[PDB]
Amino acid sequence: IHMNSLIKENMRMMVVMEGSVNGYQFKCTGEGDGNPYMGTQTMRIKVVEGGPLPFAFDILATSFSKTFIKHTKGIPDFFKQSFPEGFTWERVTRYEDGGVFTVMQDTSLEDGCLVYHAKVTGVNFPSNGAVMQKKTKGWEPNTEMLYPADGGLRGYSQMALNVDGGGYLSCSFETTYRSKKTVENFKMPGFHFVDHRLERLEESDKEMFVVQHEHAVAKFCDLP
Amino acid sequence: IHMNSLIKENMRMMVVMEGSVNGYQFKCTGEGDGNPYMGTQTMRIKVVEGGPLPFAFDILATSFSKTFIKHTKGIPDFFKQSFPEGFTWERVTRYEDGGVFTVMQDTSLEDGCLVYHAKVTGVNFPSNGAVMQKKTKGWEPNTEMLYPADGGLRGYSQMALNVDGGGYLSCSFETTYRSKKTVENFKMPGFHFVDHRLERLEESDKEMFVVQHEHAVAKFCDLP
Ligand SMILES: [Ca+2]
Ligand SMILES: [Ca+2]
Numbered sequence: 287i288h289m290n291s292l293i294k295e296n297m298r299m300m301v302v303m304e305g306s307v308n309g310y311q312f313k314c315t316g317e318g319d320g321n322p323y324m325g326t327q328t329m330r331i332k333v334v335e336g337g338p339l340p341f342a343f344d345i346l347a348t349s350f351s352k353t354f355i356k357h358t359k360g361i362p363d364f365f366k367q368s369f370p371e372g373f374t375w376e377r378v379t380r381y382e383d384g385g386v387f388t389v390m391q392d393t394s395l396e397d398g399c400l401v402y403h404a405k406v407t408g409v410n411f412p413s414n415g416a417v418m419q420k421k422t423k424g425w426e427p428n429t430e431m432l433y434p435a436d437g438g439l440r441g442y443s444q445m446a447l448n449v450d451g452g453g454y455l456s457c458s459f460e461t462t463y464r465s466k467k468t469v470e471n472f473k474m475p476g477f478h479f480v481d482h483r484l485e486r487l488e489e490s491d492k493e494m495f496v497v498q499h500e501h502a503v504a505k506f507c508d509l510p
Numbered sequence: 511i512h513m514n515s516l517i518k519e520n521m522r523m524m525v526v527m528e529g530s531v532n533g534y535q536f537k538c539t540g541e542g543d544g545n546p547y548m549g550t551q552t553m554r555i556k557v558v559e560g561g562p563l564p565f566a567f568d569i570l571a572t573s574f575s576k577t578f579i580k581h582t583k584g585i586p587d588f589f590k591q592s593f594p595e596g597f598t599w600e601r602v603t604r605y606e607d608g609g610v611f612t613v614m615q616d617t618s619l620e621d622g623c624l625v626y627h628a629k630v631t632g633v634n635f636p637s638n639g640a641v642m643q644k645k646t647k648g649w650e651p652n653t654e655m656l657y658p659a660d661g662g663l664r665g666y667s668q669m670a671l672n673v674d675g676g677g678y679l680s681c682s683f684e685t686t687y688r689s690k691k692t693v694e695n696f697k698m699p700g701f702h703f704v705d706h707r708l709e710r711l712e713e714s715d716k717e718m719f720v721v722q723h724e725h726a727v728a729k730f731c732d733l734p
Contacts, residue, residue: 426701427731429653431668433678442668442680444655446701454657454701456666458682477650477670477678483733501733507651508732509707509725 292369293322299400301350307408312336316350325356328499338492342422344447347484349389349404355480355502362473364439364463369395371466379459385411416449423448427483434474438464480504516593517546523624525574531632536560540574549580549727555720562716566646568671571708573613573628579704580727586697588663588687593619595690603683609635640673647672651707658698662688704728
C-alpha cells in the first residue's frame with residue numbers, strides 16, 4: 287500500500303482497445319492515472335481507427351480497470367494480489383433491446399505502469415436503438431455482486447444507461463476475473479459487492495476524444 | 511407517517527400464496543408484523559397444502575411486502591402513496607441452471623391490515639439442481655435497481671442463493687410494480703436503489719413452518 291509495493295499510491299495506465307460493433311471495425315488508445323487504494327481514476331481516450339464511431343461511446347466505457355478499487359473491511363483484493371503476474375477479465379453484456387457486447391481483457395504490470403489490452407465485439411445492436419442512433423447520456427451508478435467461481439472471481443452487474451428523453455436503456459453482464467497467479471498463492475475474497483460510479487468528464491470531435499472518471503469501492507451490504 | 515395516515519408506524523399483514531413448481535401444486539398462508547417506515551418486518555409462514563414441499567422453500571422467500579421499505583432522502587414512496595387503493599407487483603425470476611419462477615401479486619389494505627395474494631408458477635427447475643434437491647441455505651443480501659417504466663415502477667434484481675458445500679446458485683429478476691392509483695395522483699420516484707436483507711429465522715417440519723425477517727431501505731448510490 288506504500289511507495290515500495292508493486293501497486294503504489296499513484297499508478298498510471300495505458301490501454302489499447304480494438305474490435306468491432308455491428309461489423310464496424312475500430313481501435314482506441316487511452317492513458318490515465320489514479321490512486322488504487324482510494325478507488326479513483328481518470329482516463330483520456332482517443333479513437334485512433336474508425337472514428338467518428340457510428341455508435342454510442344457509452345457502450346465501451348466499462349471496458350477501459352480493476353486495480354483501482356478501494357477495499358475496506360475484511361475483503362481480500364483479488365486484483366492487487368495478482369501482481370506481478372497480473373490478471374484477465376472476460377465478460378458478456380446483454381442490453382434489453384438485443385445488443386450484446388463481449389470483451390476479453392488482459393491486465394499486466396510493465397515497468398511500474400499498468401497495461402491493458404481489450405478485444406471487444408458488439409453484435410446485434412438495433413438499427414434504431416439508442417446505441418446505434420447515439421442517443422445515450424452516460425451511465426447511472428451501480429453495485430456489482432461478486433463471489434468465487436470457475437477458478438477465479440465471478441461478477442454480476444446490472445446497469446442503466448441514460449437515453450435522450452429522460453428514459454433508460456438497461457443491460458446486465460456476467461464477468462469472470464482470472465488471476466495469472468496460482469490459486470494457492472493469494473487470498474480469495476468471499477461474497478461481496480463493489481459500488482461503481484463511472485462518469486464522463488469531457489468529450490470532443492464526435493466522441494473521438496473522451497475523458498472518463500470512475501470511483502469504485504468494494505464492501506459488504508450496507509444493511510447490518 | 512403517524513396515526514392519521516393509512517400506513518401506521520406499525521402494520522400487520524396476511525398472505526395467501528398458491529401455485530405450483532415443476533407441476534407440484536401447493537398453498538401457503540402467513541401472518542406478520544413490521545414497521546413500514548423503519549423498513550423492517552417479520553412473518554410466520556405455513557404450508558397448508560402440498561407440504562412437505564419437494565423443493566427448497568428459499569425460492570418462495572422473496573414472494574411473501576413492498577410497504578415495509580424505509581425511504582431516505584428525496585425518494586417518493588411508490589407503495590405507501592398507493593393506498594387506500596393499493597398496488598400489484600409482477601415478476602419473473604430466472605435461475606442460472608434453468609429454473610424460472612413467475613409471480614403475480616396483489617396488495618390491498620383491509621381495516622388497517624395489509625392483505626397479500628400471490629399466484630406463483632415455477633417451471634423447468636433441474637431435477638438434480640440445488641432447488642429440487644433441497645440443498646439451499648438462504649439468500650445473500652442484494653441491491654435492487656429501480657426506475658419508472660410501463661406506467662409504473664420497474665425493478666431489476668440479481669441474487670445469490672447459498673448452497674450446500676459453500677458455493678452459490680445465482681438468479682436475476684425483473685419486476686414491474688403497478689399502483690392502483692392514477693399516475694397523476696401520486697409522486698413518481700426517479701432512478702434509485704433498495705438494499706435488501708432477507709433472512710430465515712426459523713424453520714420446522716420439513717419447512718412446513720417458516721419464519722422470515724427482512725430489512726429493506728431505499729436510497730441513492732453510496733458513491734457521490
Ligand atoms: Ca483521479
Ligand atoms: Ca443476493
